Design a protein around this motif. Structure first.
Motif, PDB file in Angstrom:
ATOM      1  N   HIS A 183       0.686   6.263  -4.465  1.00  8.51           N
ATOM      2  CA  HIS A 183       0.137   5.269  -5.410  1.00  8.51           C
ATOM      3  C   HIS A 183       1.126   5.125  -6.564  1.00  8.51           C
ATOM      4  O   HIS A 183       1.505   4.000  -6.933  1.00  8.51           O
ATOM      5  CB  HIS A 183      -1.232   5.716  -5.923  1.00  8.51           C
ATOM      6  CG  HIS A 183      -1.858   4.792  -6.931  1.00  8.51           C
ATOM      7  ND1 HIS A 183      -2.814   3.858  -6.588  1.00  8.51           N
ATOM      8  CD2 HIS A 183      -1.707   4.696  -8.276  1.00  8.51           C
ATOM      9  CE1 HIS A 183      -3.210   3.208  -7.671  1.00  8.51           C
ATOM     10  NE2 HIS A 183      -2.543   3.686  -8.706  1.00  8.51           N
ATOM     11  N   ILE A 198     -16.089  -2.513   0.604  1.00  6.16           N
ATOM     12  CA  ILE A 198     -15.821  -2.219   2.032  1.00  6.16           C
ATOM     13  C   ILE A 198     -16.137  -0.747   2.341  1.00  6.16           C
ATOM     14  O   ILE A 198     -16.947  -0.449   3.231  1.00  6.16           O
ATOM     15  CB  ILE A 198     -14.397  -2.609   2.498  1.00  6.16           C
ATOM     16  CG1 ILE A 198     -14.173  -4.113   2.288  1.00  6.16           C
ATOM     17  CG2 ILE A 198     -14.190  -2.232   3.988  1.00  6.16           C
ATOM     18  CD1 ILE A 198     -12.769  -4.614   2.576  1.00  6.16           C
ATOM     19  N   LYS A 218      -7.289 -10.123   1.385  1.00  9.15           N
ATOM     20  CA  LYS A 218      -8.165  -8.970   1.155  1.00  9.15           C
ATOM     21  C   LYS A 218      -9.317  -9.275   0.202  1.00  9.15           C
ATOM     22  O   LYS A 218     -10.389  -8.720   0.350  1.00  9.15           O
ATOM     23  CB  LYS A 218      -7.352  -7.745   0.666  1.00  9.15           C
ATOM     24  CG  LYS A 218      -8.208  -6.461   0.466  1.00  9.15           C
ATOM     25  CD  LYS A 218      -7.349  -5.215   0.236  1.00  9.15           C
ATOM     26  CE  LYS A 218      -6.465  -4.860   1.425  1.00  9.15           C
ATOM     27  NZ  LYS A 218      -7.271  -4.689   2.706  1.00  9.15           N
ATOM     28  N   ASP A 231     -12.028 -10.656   2.358  1.00  9.98           N
ATOM     29  CA  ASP A 231     -12.524  -9.553   3.174  1.00  9.98           C
ATOM     30  C   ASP A 231     -13.529  -8.708   2.364  1.00  9.98           C
ATOM     31  O   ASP A 231     -14.647  -8.392   2.849  1.00  9.98           O
ATOM     32  CB  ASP A 231     -11.304  -8.730   3.603  1.00  9.98           C
ATOM     33  CG  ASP A 231     -11.427  -8.105   4.978  1.00  9.98           C
ATOM     34  OD1 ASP A 231     -10.360  -7.754   5.510  1.00  9.98           O
ATOM     35  OD2 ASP A 231     -12.527  -7.931   5.511  1.00  9.98           O
ATOM     36  N   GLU A 232     -13.146  -8.328   1.137  1.00  7.64           N
ATOM     37  CA  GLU A 232     -14.014  -7.551   0.251  1.00  7.64           C
ATOM     38  C   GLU A 232     -15.295  -8.299  -0.080  1.00  7.64           C
ATOM     39  O   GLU A 232     -16.376  -7.704  -0.131  1.00  7.64           O
ATOM     40  CB  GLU A 232     -13.284  -7.166  -1.066  1.00  7.64           C
ATOM     41  CG  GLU A 232     -12.188  -6.142  -0.833  1.00  7.64           C
ATOM     42  CD  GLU A 232     -11.429  -5.789  -2.092  1.00  7.64           C
ATOM     43  OE1 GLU A 232     -11.641  -6.478  -3.116  1.00  7.64           O
ATOM     44  OE2 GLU A 232     -10.625  -4.820  -2.073  1.00  7.64           O
ATOM     45  N   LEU A 273     -15.540  -0.226 -12.023  1.00  3.65           N
ATOM     46  CA  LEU A 273     -14.533   0.485 -12.803  1.00  3.65           C
ATOM     47  C   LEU A 273     -14.704   0.129 -14.273  1.00  3.65           C
ATOM     48  O   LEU A 273     -14.999  -1.028 -14.604  1.00  3.65           O
ATOM     49  CB  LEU A 273     -13.127   0.073 -12.378  1.00  3.65           C
ATOM     50  CG  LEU A 273     -12.655   0.603 -11.002  1.00  3.65           C
ATOM     51  CD1 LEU A 273     -11.386  -0.127 -10.583  1.00  3.65           C
ATOM     52  CD2 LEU A 273     -12.423   2.149 -11.027  1.00  3.65           C
ATOM     53  N   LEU A 300      -5.701   3.245 -12.847  1.00  2.00           N
ATOM     54  CA  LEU A 300      -5.403   3.011 -11.440  1.00  2.00           C
ATOM     55  C   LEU A 300      -4.407   1.867 -11.256  1.00  2.00           C
ATOM     56  O   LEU A 300      -3.825   1.722 -10.181  1.00  2.00           O
ATOM     57  CB  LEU A 300      -6.678   2.688 -10.655  1.00  2.00           C
ATOM     58  CG  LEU A 300      -7.653   3.853 -10.493  1.00  2.00           C
ATOM     59  CD1 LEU A 300      -8.914   3.421  -9.780  1.00  2.00           C
ATOM     60  CD2 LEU A 300      -6.963   4.948  -9.726  1.00  2.00           C
ATOM     61  N   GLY A 301      -4.235   1.050 -12.294  1.00  2.00           N
ATOM     62  CA  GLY A 301      -3.393  -0.152 -12.195  1.00  2.00           C
ATOM     63  C   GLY A 301      -3.932  -1.165 -11.196  1.00  2.00           C
ATOM     64  O   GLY A 301      -3.181  -1.758 -10.422  1.00  2.00           O
ATOM     65  N   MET A 302      -5.248  -1.342 -11.180  1.00  2.00           N
ATOM     66  CA  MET A 302      -5.851  -2.389 -10.370  1.00  2.00           C
ATOM     67  C   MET A 302      -6.846  -3.213 -11.184  1.00  2.00           C
ATOM     68  O   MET A 302      -7.353  -2.741 -12.215  1.00  2.00           O
ATOM     69  CB  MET A 302      -6.492  -1.810  -9.098  1.00  2.00           C
ATOM     70  CG  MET A 302      -7.633  -0.856  -9.352  1.00  2.00           C
ATOM     71  SD  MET A 302      -8.336  -0.235  -7.783  1.00  2.00           S
ATOM     72  CE  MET A 302      -6.936   0.657  -7.098  1.00  2.00           C
ATOM     73  N   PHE A 307      -9.011  -3.677  -4.132  1.00  2.00           N
ATOM     74  CA  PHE A 307      -9.004  -2.263  -4.498  1.00  2.00           C
ATOM     75  C   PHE A 307      -8.046  -1.406  -3.655  1.00  2.00           C
ATOM     76  O   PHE A 307      -7.804  -0.237  -3.969  1.00  2.00           O
ATOM     77  CB  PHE A 307     -10.428  -1.693  -4.419  1.00  2.00           C
ATOM     78  CG  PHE A 307     -11.423  -2.421  -5.298  1.00  2.00           C
ATOM     79  CD1 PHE A 307     -12.365  -3.265  -4.735  1.00  2.00           C
ATOM     80  CD2 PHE A 307     -11.380  -2.285  -6.676  1.00  2.00           C
ATOM     81  CE1 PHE A 307     -13.279  -3.939  -5.518  1.00  2.00           C
ATOM     82  CE2 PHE A 307     -12.299  -2.956  -7.485  1.00  2.00           C
ATOM     83  CZ  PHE A 307     -13.246  -3.780  -6.912  1.00  2.00           C
ATOM     84  N   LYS A 308      -7.507  -1.993  -2.595  1.00  2.00           N
ATOM     85  CA  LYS A 308      -6.659  -1.261  -1.656  1.00  2.00           C
ATOM     86  C   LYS A 308      -5.374  -2.035  -1.377  1.00  2.00           C
ATOM     87  O   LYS A 308      -5.376  -3.286  -1.399  1.00  2.00           O
ATOM     88  CB  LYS A 308      -7.393  -1.048  -0.315  1.00  2.00           C
ATOM     89  CG  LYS A 308      -8.684  -0.236  -0.408  1.00  2.00           C
ATOM     90  CD  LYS A 308      -8.429   1.219  -0.765  1.00  2.00           C
ATOM     91  CE  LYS A 308      -9.759   2.010  -0.691  1.00  2.00           C
ATOM     92  NZ  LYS A 308     -10.779   1.571  -1.715  1.00  2.00           N
ATOM     93  N   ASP A 316      -2.238  -3.525   1.062  1.00  2.00           N
ATOM     94  CA  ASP A 316      -2.327  -4.272   2.303  1.00  2.00           C
ATOM     95  C   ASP A 316      -2.339  -3.392   3.557  1.00  2.00           C
ATOM     96  O   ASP A 316      -2.941  -3.761   4.574  1.00  2.00           O
ATOM     97  CB  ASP A 316      -1.158  -5.262   2.376  1.00  2.00           C
ATOM     98  CG  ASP A 316      -1.346  -6.307   3.459  1.00  2.00           C
ATOM     99  OD1 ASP A 316      -0.384  -6.563   4.237  1.00  2.00           O
ATOM    100  OD2 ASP A 316      -2.461  -6.886   3.537  1.00  2.00           O
ATOM    101  N   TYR A 320      -3.763  -0.483   3.875  1.00  2.00           N
ATOM    102  CA  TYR A 320      -4.900   0.460   3.932  1.00  2.00           C
ATOM    103  C   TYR A 320      -5.673   0.324   5.225  1.00  2.00           C
ATOM    104  O   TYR A 320      -6.007  -0.796   5.651  1.00  2.00           O
ATOM    105  CB  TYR A 320      -5.813   0.272   2.724  1.00  2.00           C
ATOM    106  CG  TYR A 320      -6.753   1.412   2.519  1.00  2.00           C
ATOM    107  CD1 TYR A 320      -6.297   2.649   2.027  1.00  2.00           C
ATOM    108  CD2 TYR A 320      -8.112   1.263   2.780  1.00  2.00           C
ATOM    109  CE1 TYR A 320      -7.202   3.727   1.819  1.00  2.00           C
ATOM    110  CE2 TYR A 320      -9.012   2.320   2.575  1.00  2.00           C
ATOM    111  CZ  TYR A 320      -8.541   3.551   2.094  1.00  2.00           C
ATOM    112  OH  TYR A 320      -9.452   4.572   1.881  1.00  2.00           O
ATOM    113  N   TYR A 367      -8.724   2.039   5.957  1.00  2.00           N
ATOM    114  CA  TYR A 367     -10.185   2.331   5.840  1.00  2.00           C
ATOM    115  C   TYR A 367     -10.655   3.389   6.851  1.00  2.00           C
ATOM    116  O   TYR A 367      -9.847   4.273   7.233  1.00  2.00           O
ATOM    117  CB  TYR A 367     -11.018   1.032   5.935  1.00  2.00           C
ATOM    118  CG  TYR A 367     -10.588  -0.001   4.906  1.00  2.00           C
ATOM    119  CD1 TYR A 367      -9.541  -0.894   5.180  1.00  2.00           C
ATOM    120  CD2 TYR A 367     -11.252  -0.102   3.683  1.00  2.00           C
ATOM    121  CE1 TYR A 367      -9.131  -1.816   4.270  1.00  2.00           C
ATOM    122  CE2 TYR A 367     -10.847  -1.049   2.731  1.00  2.00           C
ATOM    123  CZ  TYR A 367      -9.800  -1.908   3.044  1.00  2.00           C
ATOM    124  OH  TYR A 367      -9.401  -2.856   2.124  1.00  2.00           O
TER     125      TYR A 367
END
Ligand code: NAD
Ligand code: NAD
Ligand code: NAD
Ligand code: NAD
Ligand code: NRN
Ligand code: NRN
Ligand code: NRN
Ligand code: NRN
Ligand code: NA
Ligand code: NA
Ligand code: NA
Ligand code: NA
Lengths: 430, 429, 429, 430
Positions: free
Chosen positions: A160, A245, D386, D389-390, D407, D415-417, D423-424, D426, D428, D430
């Motif tokens: 990360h 998800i 994504k 998708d989420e 969050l 987290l830098g998001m 949240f994930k 590309d 990832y 799962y």
């Protein structure tokens, strides 16, 4: 005038060697790398500084890198994760290692600093778990960056940080993301924690799992494994998540998904798996059932507000190393494991050797890739090729007496894939 | 005479911290203290105990004392004592003769120390496995008439009591605690489901996932062990002599076959039978390299450890209770606790919560035999279902279980007493 | 008099194909035929049967006939008959009075047809739920002296037999088949583990994953139902009145609470108690939209279906045995089989393999009562453990289970008969 | 002079409508798409030819597309999967549908052909499951390709064919791979089959699962779900695999992994999940236990050599529709389900409605993306973003009473998001 190694007790080396002999026979991926590459020495000229939990498994990795021709200097990436008998075996073998269980934060940094300088020059390869060594070099020793050929990084938190570094233009060395090899993330993070979380909780507390409510914060690869382990022993598991998800996965597996603000009133056992700050706070501690057990399995100890417990409890009673029982102003008690540091390694022995052979075979492949084929790896964050990922799994099948089917020519033609793989497209999620 | 004999009295403060934590997990025992500490129903009892000297047993011992008994204690296994627990008991003034790693002759000497109190010989037995029961019957029969009752903890011990009774050699009334519902269906099952894996892990740190595990026997213990191993991703093969237990295992998705076949496949072997001659030299010779072999039944009679010691070409002690043998065929075997019960020998035995079920039954049995001896002629008896139900009820609040009460209309419909018991005597749960 | 009464004799050829397939899954029953068809131990028996007229029951009926009995049959539920199975039996010349979707008055008429044979009145009862037993005792007491025995299949029926005996109103000896080990611990548990979900799916096709399911009762049936639902990813909440069963469910990771709380959370409700007044209007009013509600206990007494019919503002029949109600609060309830047992009413009941356990016990009980009546005074009796073990043994070969035999040294060590029985009478498995 | 629809019995429509009303309340993703887009009609001008199992769930999808402004003509993608009451409801609603349970192969092709021509022109969008419609147009009607804006494809086999088409230069229309949305592959393929496989086997045979040995060929998303379902009812499950990664997963979950050449001697139930030809052959059938049940859940009926059974058996006895019992020359019997066609849809009702709401919400999003933003989609095979998708998962949480955590600003910074995701990364899995 520099120390050659620093370990708790080099006299533990004979016991450590016995544990290493047993681990070797559980780690066929690493042993195959030795068999294939001990003669040709692909890592000759490499000077690898490693910052990775100094366990029996890591000892087998270290001796593999040395067998392949590298010089190595090592430190642990957590103050409580070292296994002193493993560290002793490595020290006795003449490999510079600076690691012991129960370092202070000052000693921890000092240990990393001991790994930077070899007889023939500064480090030229990094093998990291969590990014502390990568960050140390970039921040405090930028003059060494040009002499480093590559970084391989083990864990979700560390990768990360690499992606963040690359996106901010801070990364100056090519890196391979080992965490996200299929044979790492889908095995180590999942099946490893499925075994080693309960091991940490049990060795620390001997608590019964059956009948308890357990709250698992996060339902990524680690949380999936932790949740499954707890449920298997008869705990009722409640999940928290920010990702819809992962939350939907947890609900479809039969777990209640709610917030920590609600779950704190119900949990007897709390396990944080998020890699995020501010998961269990004072407001949660004050609502917990008596003798709630609280621990963290994420890389950094940032998830649980341990400082709140130290500042607000009436008394902290040390039960034994890495187990503290706090008495709160409400008259209830909280059992905190490993001062909020990763519980599987801090209170038990971390993942068992067989699954670590998957992760560490990837590490050896990444070191070979970066050291011997640097032109394939510009500055940036890269994955190992799928054919190598598959090869890691294949190397572990014989130990398990798995009989893999081979495609016939006719089948391979029908599927439009090679008989020897790769068998899946790049986006396959397994 | 010695006040006690333990490994290291210096461990007492740590032991006491462990006892403090365990008390809060053992609400049944704490409830017995709350109810009976004032009235002291065990006043006059002189209880000799032979039972694994663990943290949990320390909580049981201090409960018996709170209830007014005098107690003298020994362990029922040479490797099961937890030295910090023994030290806490000794420091509290209770005569305990127990340490981890006794020789077999020391083991007997420890039991012999529990026989005589200040006021006279023992008058109650609390036994786990029948060694104290058998010692008195065979070597000290002159003491039998002075003993009011025996309560017996484990399947192997109660099996021996029934054998003694059928042969006409049992001379003291006994309560079978193992076969309380709240013991057999909880301790033997859920206890082993957690503590088997604990023993294997602390000893070897082996990965369970991906392994073949062979469990001999599919009784209460075997059911728990099999579920534990399967839960971590072992493929579990069962052996059985009883067609009913065999069919249960098959209906749960386990392959059921003989040890003669399964010895060729297992990476981990766990014996749960209570029977002699389960894993023999002819099995060891066929095992996969570095097969881990262990026993969880009461006596070390299931695995032929003598065969390994005599036939291996190399034997290396890895650490206490873990030995690695090299056979003439070039392969290795890892043997845990010299074939003694692995959960107690290599780990800490069952967790405290489930032991509170078993030990609440033990306290009830001691009260029944001591205060109502005329209810119990020579023979082997069960606790009444109402008491069995009461044990379970005492543990519900800790788990925040909300039990439903029948309405009077429902109890009339069922023809059931509204406060129980709720099941007929033949109910199997 | 009618030779039979069924829905459609035209279904007989299909029914026969289903019977052929089921025979090959029922090795216990086929073994009874192999052993006893020549000697005909049931010669002279005139057996009236009241038991769900399914494919499996057809195999049982033809086994009784092969053994020399005359048989006349009815179903014990208005929705459980499988019309192809009834047709195959009728076509074979056996008097069967049964069809899916009987009125309650037709149901009684069907039982009444089974009472009289060519040579005289019935002399044996084979009952599931006690309706035939109760009919004869209450309405035809003049027939009692001519009846040699009753064998009874299900928990609710045996509960009634014990009640009758304790009140002094039972007048014929009975064998409790439900509490054979190979019945209660297999049929009630593993049978419901498969057939509950079958009933819910065929009725509604609802996804189980992600739902909250509330199971009332955690006896043998509740244990199977809970495991089934959890296996597909439902979060299962249990209700219980018995602290022992409650603690078992808690130790298996289920939340245990009251229906008063759980009615607010469940998407699926399954009643398994055998008790009246489990799901009431005050529960329905709190349920999540489109909650599916069903019962798997013998009698339709658990759910207040009268309340829905009287209080709903809309009621739409979706298809046979599936009704959707709209309540005054604007939410919907889906009710399966008008509260009658859902696995048999909305699907095909238990699969044949496990029914071979139950029905092998039934054939043994009929043989015992018919040929050894002096062993069975008026009262309620169990089959001997040796016969119980024999039932399990008869099903091992089909599953390719390899049972271990004790050596003579091991049997001497254990003090055990080498061919069994292997467990004491109190063993709970 | 063209038929307006063709279904088994339009009189089933009232019953079909009742089943659709129930399904709507289980499909909050589709209902949300109707709520958000029924007024603005993003699909106005679209003429969508659909080739996808004509079930109750598909009926809810169809009515959603129409509510959003599309014209639609429909056929099923399997000869046995149509649910006649659902087809009747759609026909009665005035939507051209050509589908019935038990089509012949000739009728099947004819049905697809009925969907190509609308009142105002040829189709201009494809919604496909398995690629038959995509392949028909490319091979037999290439003159229609220029008028087609996009293809969305539902299933693993169909997307496999799209990637093959693109790599061979045969694909001439942009396509979205719906199968590989996270909220499709990780839910539909896994949890859907976990329920619908057993449903198909039970409705066909009523066989007991407990005590049996079941052999599952393939341990991809489908095989993972099938295996878990069988194990849950007490079958002993044996897995076959060609991919060493999937094989290692299966071994680590406690399953025996061996070849079909060995497993055929042991299995009582066989389920093929591979998407590959030549999985169960004559040499396997001849070694099977008596009354072994054999079925396929992969898209095409290519896995089981049914022709061998027809040519080599002494007799085939039809038990009921889609269940045949073959008597072999060795005296043993084989029970074959749905003539080797997908068993969950052929012998039961396929996946339940809730999980199909995930897959079908993705389908609606893909149709909107391709129809309204064609410039984002050149010729090639694309994934949904994504964030969408989420959004599919998030739309299903309320029905399940899941409480998702948000969050805090401090956590999102750490987290830098973004607080609202994605949240994930590309890659990832799962
Ligand atoms: N101790 C070990 O042996 C071990 C093994 C592998 C990985 N790790 C470490 O474990 C941690 C998790 O790893 P992972 O691979 O599971 O990562 P992951 O990204 O797959 O899973 C973490 C999950 O946490 C969730 N999350 C983030 N913030 C949250 C919050 N505030 N509340 C609830 N949920 C939240 C995310 O949505 C994500 O699904 C990392 O720090 C990693 O380095 C530890
Ligand atoms: N370590 C512990 O914490 C612990 C806990 C409870 C019980 N125990 C002990 O464990 C043992 C088993 O107890 P249990 O309650 O499960 O008894 P049990 O009678 O319920 O089960 C033992 C099973 O072994 C089977 N068996 C007997 N001989 C066999 C053989 N030769 N091969 C295969 N199977 C055979 C029997 O058929 C029986 O089903 C006993 O010695 C008991 O005292 C130990
Ligand atoms: N449908 C079928 O195929 C099938 C199969 C077997 C048994 N049955 C029937 O199922 C029912 C249950 O049988 P069982 O063998 O599980 O009986 P059981 O006695 O083992 O279990 C019933 C449980 O319900 C609990 N209970 C009673 N009243 C309750 C209430 N008010 N609230 C909550 N819990 C309550 C009891 O404590 C008991 O544990 C009986 O009617 C039996 O005849 C049906
Ligand atoms: N019936 C349904 O409702 C349903 C649902 C989803 C997908 N599908 C279909 O199911 C099939 C599988 O889908 P998936 O998503 O699981 O694909 P997948 O690619 O994830 O899994 C298939 C697995 O089969 C293995 N395999 C290939 N050839 C094999 C062989 N000869 N022997 C053993 N293993 C082999 C592969 O290694 C792969 O892991 C596809 O045809 C797909 O279209 C059906
Ligand atoms: N035994 C171990 N040795 C060395 N490293 C270990 C061990 N267990 C877990 N890890 C690490 C912890 C890291 O977060 C993860 O990558 C995992 O591989
Ligand atoms: N922790 C323990 N303390 C004391 N005794 C224990 C413990 N774990 C298992 N046992 C015993 C072993 C016996 O066989 C069984 O009865 C069980 O209760
Ligand atoms: N298929 C069946 N045939 C005939 N009877 C069946 C069936 N399934 C469940 N039962 C009964 C219902 C009864 O309650 C239980 O005893 C069980 O055996
Ligand atoms: N009920 C269903 N309706 C419509 N389609 C269904 C259904 N069940 C499975 N599928 C398909 C089968 C396809 O292979 C898969 O994509 C899955 O979504
Ligand atoms: Na280790
Ligand atoms: Na303990
Ligand atoms: Na059937
Ligand atoms: Na449906």
């Amino acid at each position: 005038d520099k120390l050659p190694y620093k370990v708790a007790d080099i006299g533990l080396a004979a016991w450590g060697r016995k544990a290493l002999d047993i681990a070797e026979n559980e780690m066929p991926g690493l042993m195959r790398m030795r068999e294939m590459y001990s003669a040709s020495k692909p890592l000759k000229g490499a000077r690898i500084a490693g910052c990775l939990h100094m366990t029996v498994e890591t000892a087998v990795l270290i001796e593999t890198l040395v067998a392949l021709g590298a010089e190595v200097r090592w430190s642990s990436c957590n103050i409580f994760s070292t296994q002193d008998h493993a560290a002793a075996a490595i020290a006795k073998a003449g490999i510079p290692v600076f690691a012991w269980k129960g370092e202070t934060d000052e000693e921890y940094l000092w240990c990393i600093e001991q790994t930077l300088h070899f007889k023939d020059g500064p480090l030229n390869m990094i093998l990291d778990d969590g990014g502390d060594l990568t960050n140390l070099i970039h921040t405090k020793y930028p003059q060494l960056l040009s002499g480093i050929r590559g970084i391989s990084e083990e864990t979700t938190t560390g990768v990360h940080n690499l992606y963040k570094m690359m996106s901010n233009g801070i990364l100056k060395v090519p890196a391979i993301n080992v965490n996200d090899s299929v044979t790492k993330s889908k095995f180590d993070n999942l099946y490893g924690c499925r075994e080693s979380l309960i091991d940490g909780i049990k060795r620390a507390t001997d608590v019964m799992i059956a009948g308890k409510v357990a709250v698992v914060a996060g339902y990524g690869d680690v949380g999936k494994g932790c949740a499954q382990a707890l449920r298997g022993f008869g705990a009722r598991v409640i999940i928290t998540e920010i990702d819809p998800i992962n939350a939907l996965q947890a609900a479809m597996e039969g777990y209640e998904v709610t917030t920590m603000d609600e779950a704190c009133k119900e949990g007897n056992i709390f396990v944080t798996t998020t890699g995020c700050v501010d998961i269990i706070l004072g407001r949660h501690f004050e609502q917990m059932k008596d003798d709630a057990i609280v621990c963290n399995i994420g890389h950094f100890d940032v998830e649980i507000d341990v400082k709140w417990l130290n500042e607000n409890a009436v008394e902290k009673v040390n039960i034994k190393p890495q187990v503290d029982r706090y008495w709160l102003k409400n008259g209830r008690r909280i059992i905190l494991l490993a001062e909020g540091r990763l519980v599987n390694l801090g209170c038990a022995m971390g993942h068992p050797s067989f699954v670590m052979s998957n992760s560490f075979t990837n590490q050896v492949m990444a070191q070979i890739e970066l050291w011997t084929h640097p032109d394939k790896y510009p500055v940036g964050v890269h994955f190992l090729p799928k054919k190598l990922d598959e090869a890691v799994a294949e190397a572990h099948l014989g130990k398990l007496n798995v009989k893999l089917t081979k495609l016939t020519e006719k089948q391979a033609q029908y599927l439009g894939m090679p008989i020897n793989g790769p068998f899946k497209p790049d986006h396959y999620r397994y």
